[PDB]
C-alpha cells in the first residue's frame, strides 16, 4: 500500500487517466505502485513513470527557483519566512527525488538487461541526482558525481548498443550536456557533446522511416537550440 491492493493493470490504466486529467501527483503515485509490484516495465510504462515524476518535480523546481530568487534578493541589511518556505519546498523536492532514486535502485536498474531499458533508467538516475545537485549546498560534490556516474554509464551503453538517432540516446546526450553546462561548470564539454551528438545523428537520418525521422529530428532541434543559446 497504499497502492498495494490495486491490480498492476489498474494502476497503469489509472496512470493514463491521471495524465489525461493532468493529475501528475496521482499519476506518480499510481506508477510508484506499479513499479512496486516488482515486474519489469514495458517501453510505454517507462514513459509513464518518466512523465509522472518529471511533471511533479518540475512544478517543485519552478517553485523553488521562484522562492530562491526572492530569498537572494532579501539578502544584499522580512524575518525567517522566505527561508522557511523555500526550505519546505526544497525538502519536498528532495523527497520526490529520493523516492524516484529509490525505485530505480529497488529494483528497476538491476533487473534492466536490455540496452534501452538500462539506458532509460540510468538517464533518469542522472536527472534526479542533477535535481538534487541544483539545491545542494560537501555533500554537493558527491551528489554531482553520482549524477555524472549515472549519465556516464548510460552514455557508454548507448554508444555501444544504440544507433546515434535513437531518441533515448539523443535525450540522454542532451541532458548530460545540460548537466555539463549547468552543474559541472564545463560549458566546453557541454557544447562538444551537443555538437558531436547532433552531427552523428544527422549522418544517420538517411536510415530512418518517416516516423522515426520525425522522432529523432525533434530532439536534434532541441540540441541545436541549446547550442545556439550557448554560442
Amino acid at each position: 500500500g497504499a497502492m498495494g491492493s490495486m491490480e498492476r493493470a489498474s494502476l497503469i490504466q489509472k496512470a493514463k487517466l491521471a495524465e489525461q486529467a493532468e493529475r501528475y501527483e496521482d499519476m506518480a503515485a499510481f506508477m510508484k505502485g506499479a513499479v512496486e509490484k516488482g515486474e519489469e516495465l514495458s517501453c510505454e510504462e517507462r514513459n509513464l513513470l518518466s512523465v509522472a515524476y518529471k511533471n511533479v518535480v518540475g512544478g517543485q523546481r519552478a517553485a523553488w527557483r521562484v522562492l530562491s530568487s526572492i530569498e537572494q534578493k532579501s539578502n544584499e541589511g522580512k524575518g525567517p519566512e522566505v527561508r522557511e518556505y523555500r526550505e519546505k519546498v526544497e525538502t519536498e523536492l528532495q523527497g520526490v527525488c529520493d523516492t524516484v532514486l529509490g525505485l530505480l535502485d529497488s529494483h528497476l536498474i538491476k533487473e534492466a538487461g536490455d540496452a534501452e531499458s538500462r539506458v532509460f533508467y540510468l538517464k533518469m538516475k542522472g536527472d534526479y541526482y542533477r535535481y538534487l545537485a541544483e539545491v545542494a549546498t560537501d555533500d554537493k560534490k558527491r551528489i554531482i558525481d553520482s549524477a555524472r556516474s549515472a549519465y556516464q554509464e548510460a552514455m557508454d551503453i548507448s554508444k555501444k548498443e544504440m544507433p546515434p538517432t535513437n531518441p533515448i540516446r539523443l535525450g540522454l546526450a542532451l541532458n548530460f550536456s545540460v548537466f555539463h553546462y549547468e552543474i559541472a561548470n564545463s560549458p566546453e564539454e557541454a557544447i562538444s557533446l551537443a555538437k558531436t551528438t547532433f552531427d552523428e545523428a544527422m549522418a544517420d537520418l538517411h536510415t530512418l522511416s518517416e516516423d522515426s525521422y520525425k522522432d529523432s529530428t525533434l530532439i536534434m532541434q532541441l540540441l541545436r537550440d541549446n547550442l545556439t543559446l550557448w554560442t
Binding site: 514513459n47 518518466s50 518529471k54 536527472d127 541532458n175 545540460v178 530532439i219 537550440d225 543559446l229 550557448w230
Partner: peptide, 7 residues
C-alpha cells in the same frame, strides 16, 4: 536555465 529534454 538551459532547457533540458521535456518528457
Amino acid at each position: 536555465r538551459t532547457p533540458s529534454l521535456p518528457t
